[PDB]
Amino acid sequence: QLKLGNSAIVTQENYCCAYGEWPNYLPPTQPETATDRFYTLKSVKWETGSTGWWWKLPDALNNIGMFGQNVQHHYLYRSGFLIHVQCNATKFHQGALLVVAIPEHQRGAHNTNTSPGFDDIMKGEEGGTFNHPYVLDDGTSLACATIFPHQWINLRTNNSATIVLPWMNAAPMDFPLRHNQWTLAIIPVVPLGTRTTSSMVPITVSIAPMCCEFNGLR
Amino acid sequence: QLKLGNSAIVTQENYCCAYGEWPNYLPPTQPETATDRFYTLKSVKWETGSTGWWWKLPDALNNIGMFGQNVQHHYLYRSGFLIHVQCNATKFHQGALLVVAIPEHQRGAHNTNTSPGFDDIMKGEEGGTFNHPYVLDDGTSLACATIFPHQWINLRTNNSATIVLPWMNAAPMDFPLRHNQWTLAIIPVVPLGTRTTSSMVPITVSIAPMCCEFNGLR
Amino acid sequence: QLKLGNSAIVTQENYCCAYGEWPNYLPPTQPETATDRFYTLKSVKWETGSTGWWWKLPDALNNIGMFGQNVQHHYLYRSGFLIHVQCNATKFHQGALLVVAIPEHQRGAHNTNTSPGFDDIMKGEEGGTFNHPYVLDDGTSLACATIFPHQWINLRTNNSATIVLPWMNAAPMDFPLRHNQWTLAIIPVVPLGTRTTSSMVPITVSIAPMCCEFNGLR
Amino acid sequence: GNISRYYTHWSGSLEMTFMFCGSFMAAGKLILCYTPPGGSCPTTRETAML
Amino acid sequence: NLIVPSESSDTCSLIGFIAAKDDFSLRLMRDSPDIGQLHAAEAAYQ
Amino acid sequence: GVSETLVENFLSRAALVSKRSFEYKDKNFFKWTINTRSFVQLRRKLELFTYLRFDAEITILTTVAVNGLPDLTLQAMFVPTGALTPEKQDSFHWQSGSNASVFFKISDPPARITIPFMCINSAYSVFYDGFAGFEKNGLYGINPADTIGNLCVRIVNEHQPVGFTVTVRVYMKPKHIKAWAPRPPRTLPYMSIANANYK
Amino acid sequence: GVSETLVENFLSRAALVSKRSFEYKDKNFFKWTINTRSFVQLRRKLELFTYLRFDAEITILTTVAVNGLPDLTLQAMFVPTGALTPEKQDSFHWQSGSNASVFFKISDPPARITIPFMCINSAYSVFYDGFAGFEKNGLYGINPADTIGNLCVRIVNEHQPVGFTVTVRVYMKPKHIKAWAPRPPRTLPYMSIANANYK
């Protein structure tokens, strides 16, 4: 069970301390029970031909709850994350998710010289979808994307993945409205498959901001 | 995991020390990492109407690998066996294998006075098939064949069987090209059954010659 | 008597540890009784007008026995040699053999700019014959060829020569099919002579690979 | 294979890992065969047994 | 063979990883042949 | 062989980062905005990581060719972030003392300055998943703190009656490299120096 | 007098190993594959031994002559084994940072680099009794690991309206020589630099 604040998760079937770092406070206000809670996002309809999904952080949580208020009222933030991705399948679904948390995922548009705009990057609660997940939509390789902190959801073995993100910045505190540190990237490497139905296994993303700090209240 | 020599078996779901005897050396050359390895035979297509399969030892391994070279170059052999039979079914297949290792299985032909020839006995890697498995093809009874060393593969309970055969001879060393000590006999007592398909559960036989000795090199 | 492995030599009439180095193992599989044996080559008909003979090692033993199998099945080798050359003459033959073991004997063709091919270098059990033994077939001098490890077979004094070759390479292990470390060069400096017959004194070469190592088995 | 294209000489043990991504009921056997340098690649499964 | 039930998919899949172990050594640095050939490349001089 | 794979030994390499030939009779000088995004070979090494902390060791190498080679005196003033870059060869900003000018000749050994770590933050965000401007017109992937500065090079001499091309090769060697959060090596080719677009 | 016969004192001698005059207006540069097999005087000293382990101390000496001598800047990039050699004077491989370039002038003292021991094996097989290729087309006497590299020298300057010949003398002085397994001195003359053919 993963109970932080008021929101709890009774998860029923393994932490990945991202780069071996547990999130601590800055050695500012510290909302410890107001924001440290699982802002469970909408579960995504994972079909067979789904390419992937990306949620930039804290862009995914700028509009949600007490953390969403403390973004649009404060000015800086300092907060690690704890992403609990759970992909509840039966014993008859197959597939593999690379639940990878990419720091500073500067995306790239396909086949144009124009940079991606504000609309193509800052999606929010709805999240994104990989246009070309083999290259992570930044020209790199999915095959080497395990260099980032990651866990595999192999539906043969597990349905869940828990990644504990630290404060990942050169700066001590940064913009939540402009800058997005991490990017929870869930990419189905092996696609979903079962013969009887073109099935769906919804992937629930629950992002608890660990150890929130804030400054600059207006 | 069953790793002997270079060949390994990552078996994923209980030894039967045959007649309570672990194979030791003779109190000769002793190939300890050249031949002590799992010569995994071809998996046999087990349908519903399959009668059984028999592999005489070491006739099954006279043509395979470093043990197959050391049969056709040396003259005598002294070697126990370790047979790992695995019958990988789902939780929807039913059946029962008597994986029994019969010492000195002098077979008999049906309805003739002529003895079985060299072709009817020394099959090799391809193995044999019981023409009348109720009588073990030697006039005896399958019902009493548990007097030999045996394990049951009841697909309700287990998919594997491991039998550890000692040196079973009156002689200290004997012919590999003429004499066959043991006989791995896999007989489906309860046949395979499932309604949706006339299914197959392939039965993998892996015979590791334990504690090989040899003499008479030409 | 020189008994290594199963092959023995009852030699009946002085080691030359080549560069003072006794062959040891690398501080890999180590065939200690399978390959450490005298692969006695064919005795060469030494007439009066014979120029010399050369056997590149281990090219001379790539087709012979357990060492010949472990060349054409493994990939690297590490093995010193022990060459016992014996030139069985009476007390009426005269002559002198420079039994010299030349490391890295890069030969040269006579009167052409083309390098020697695979056929002119990798002879095998049949060995070679010096086209110009005064210059060792590499432009150097026979007169200075005693800078290599060598023993003299002066038929006045001795009939035998035993050279103990170490592992002579910059590399720790090398190719047996492509590279030939040493070269047993037997050159009659003083030719054979007796008045009553144009006689022959056959020169038996016995090359025991000392301390064989191998890697890369296919 | 991308960091060692910045470097000429590479010398060490690799480590493959094959993860199966079927259903939980799915059973079957595979036969992974490390083949060294030197000879022919195995084409039949019995050649790969050795 | 591949044995799946009548509800699982007939097609399964394998993912293969590779890592180097701790004894992996590397030397004599050169350039990578992977990249090779930019828009607004002269904007650093503007 | 575990020491040549150090990130200090992997990245500290004086690769060419800028090369512009300017005539003399940008107008008759050149400024080069110091980025690592210029050449595709050093960029892919530095796009292996997310956060870099390096002191650049800029070595300005000036050649010359006519149309007797003259012995000129050059200036290689480094304009940092915030200070103003010259628009002319004889502007007032060349005379600005607080900028780190270095005065060298063609016939000298090449001028070499060690530009320190000059980010506002503790490391250079090689990839910045954010926006510089506070409106929606701000460009993506440009950290406001990532700016090294500007390397502005002119010929200190007055006008000479010979017309001649001056080619300047700028070599950057990062020093004291601390690198954080490695990334996959980019497989697809680049499309621009400002962003990570792929084709 | 037993100390001048040391192999360190016998072989560490800056003998000329390469000398090629290239014009300027191989096309207008030269690459030299670093072997000891070039001149017959240093080769016979080094063919006295079988295995050599030496660091080469390459000293590139560049002279110049017209048809006032211009003051040029040269590059003497050492392309190691595996890295690619330039085919043109202005190719991209001159800009490759990971190659060990050295930038010098004609009027400077001669450029001097110490190329390290760069065999894959523990010594240079001077004589290799084997074959490089894995087929029967592979050449005899060429160790794949014996390759030092390639010494590629160009003029960094652009085109100048004078036409002039540049003669470059490359002097190699082996250092820290460890030598194994001495051989007879070769008496017959050479026939090629690739092999030991005699006449």
Coordinates of C-alpha atoms in Angstrom, one line a residue, chain A residues 39-161:
Chain A
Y39 CA -2.2 12.7 -8.1
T40 CA -3.4 9.7 -10.0
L41 CA -3.7 10.7 -13.7
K42 CA -6.3 9.4 -16.1
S43 CA -5.7 5.8 -17.2
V44 CA -4.6 5.5 -20.8
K45 CA -6.3 3.1 -23.2
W46 CA -3.5 0.8 -24.3
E47 CA -4.4 -1.0 -27.5
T48 CA -2.2 -3.1 -29.7
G49 CA -1.1 -0.2 -32.0
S50 CA -0.4 2.3 -29.2
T51 CA 3.0 3.9 -29.6
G52 CA 3.6 5.3 -26.1
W53 CA 2.7 8.1 -23.7
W54 CA 4.8 10.9 -22.1
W55 CA 4.0 13.1 -19.1
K56 CA 6.4 15.9 -18.5
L57 CA 6.8 16.8 -14.9
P58 CA 5.6 19.0 -13.2
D59 CA 3.7 20.0 -16.3
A60 CA 1.4 17.0 -15.7
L61 CA 0.5 18.4 -12.3
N62 CA 0.3 22.2 -12.8
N63 CA -3.5 22.1 -13.0
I64 CA -4.3 19.5 -10.3
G65 CA -5.0 20.0 -6.7
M66 CA -2.9 21.6 -4.0
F67 CA 0.3 21.1 -6.0
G68 CA -1.6 22.7 -9.0
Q69 CA -2.5 25.7 -6.8
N70 CA 1.1 26.0 -5.4
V71 CA 2.4 26.1 -9.0
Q72 CA 0.1 28.8 -10.2
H73 CA 0.5 30.9 -7.0
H74 CA 4.2 30.3 -6.1
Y75 CA 7.1 31.0 -8.4
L76 CA 9.8 28.4 -7.9
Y77 CA 9.4 24.7 -6.9
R78 CA 11.7 22.1 -5.5
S79 CA 10.2 18.6 -5.4
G80 CA 11.2 15.1 -6.2
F81 CA 8.6 12.7 -7.6
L82 CA 7.4 9.2 -7.0
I83 CA 5.7 7.7 -10.1
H84 CA 3.7 4.6 -9.5
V85 CA 2.7 3.2 -12.9
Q86 CA 0.4 0.2 -12.8
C87 CA -0.8 -1.7 -15.9
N88 CA -3.5 -4.1 -14.7
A89 CA -3.6 -7.0 -17.1
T90 CA -4.9 -10.6 -16.7
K91 CA -2.8 -13.7 -17.1
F92 CA -3.7 -13.7 -20.8
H93 CA -2.3 -10.4 -21.9
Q94 CA 1.2 -10.0 -23.2
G95 CA 3.4 -7.0 -23.6
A96 CA 6.3 -5.0 -22.2
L97 CA 6.3 -1.4 -21.1
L98 CA 9.5 0.6 -20.8
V99 CA 8.4 2.9 -18.0
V100 CA 11.3 5.2 -18.2
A101 CA 11.7 8.6 -16.6
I102 CA 13.7 10.8 -18.9
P103 CA 15.4 13.9 -17.4
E104 CA 15.3 17.0 -19.5
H105 CA 13.5 15.4 -22.4
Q106 CA 14.0 18.1 -25.0
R107 CA 11.7 16.7 -27.7
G108 CA 12.1 17.2 -31.4
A109 CA 9.5 17.7 -34.2
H110 CA 9.6 15.4 -37.2
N111 CA 10.8 16.6 -40.6
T112 CA 10.9 20.3 -39.9
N113 CA 13.4 22.9 -38.7
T114 CA 10.9 24.7 -36.4
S115 CA 11.2 24.0 -32.7
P116 CA 8.2 22.5 -30.9
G117 CA 5.9 25.2 -29.5
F118 CA 4.3 25.6 -26.2
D119 CA 1.3 23.6 -27.3
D120 CA 3.4 20.6 -28.4
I121 CA 5.3 20.3 -25.1
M122 CA 3.1 21.5 -22.2
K123 CA 0.2 19.1 -22.4
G124 CA -0.7 18.7 -18.8
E125 CA -3.0 16.1 -17.3
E126 CA -3.9 14.7 -20.7
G127 CA -0.3 13.8 -21.4
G128 CA 1.3 13.1 -24.7
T129 CA 1.8 10.4 -27.3
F130 CA 5.1 9.4 -29.0
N131 CA 5.0 10.2 -32.7
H132 CA 8.1 8.1 -33.2
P133 CA 8.8 6.1 -30.0
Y134 CA 11.7 4.2 -31.5
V135 CA 13.7 7.5 -31.4
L136 CA 12.0 8.8 -28.2
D137 CA 10.9 11.8 -30.3
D138 CA 14.3 13.4 -29.8
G139 CA 16.4 11.6 -32.4
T140 CA 18.1 9.3 -29.8
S141 CA 17.4 5.6 -29.5
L142 CA 14.8 3.7 -27.6
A143 CA 17.2 0.8 -27.6
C144 CA 19.5 2.8 -25.3
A145 CA 16.8 4.5 -23.3
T146 CA 17.5 2.2 -20.3
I147 CA 20.4 4.5 -19.5
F148 CA 17.8 6.6 -17.8
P149 CA 16.0 5.4 -14.6
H150 CA 13.5 2.9 -15.7
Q151 CA 11.5 -0.2 -14.8
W152 CA 10.0 -2.8 -17.0
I153 CA 6.4 -3.7 -16.8
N154 CA 6.5 -7.2 -18.4
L155 CA 2.9 -8.4 -18.1
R156 CA 4.2 -11.9 -17.9
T157 CA 5.9 -11.0 -14.6
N158 CA 4.7 -7.7 -13.1
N159 CA 2.0 -5.1 -13.7
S160 CA 3.5 -2.2 -11.8
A161 CA 6.5 0.1 -11.8

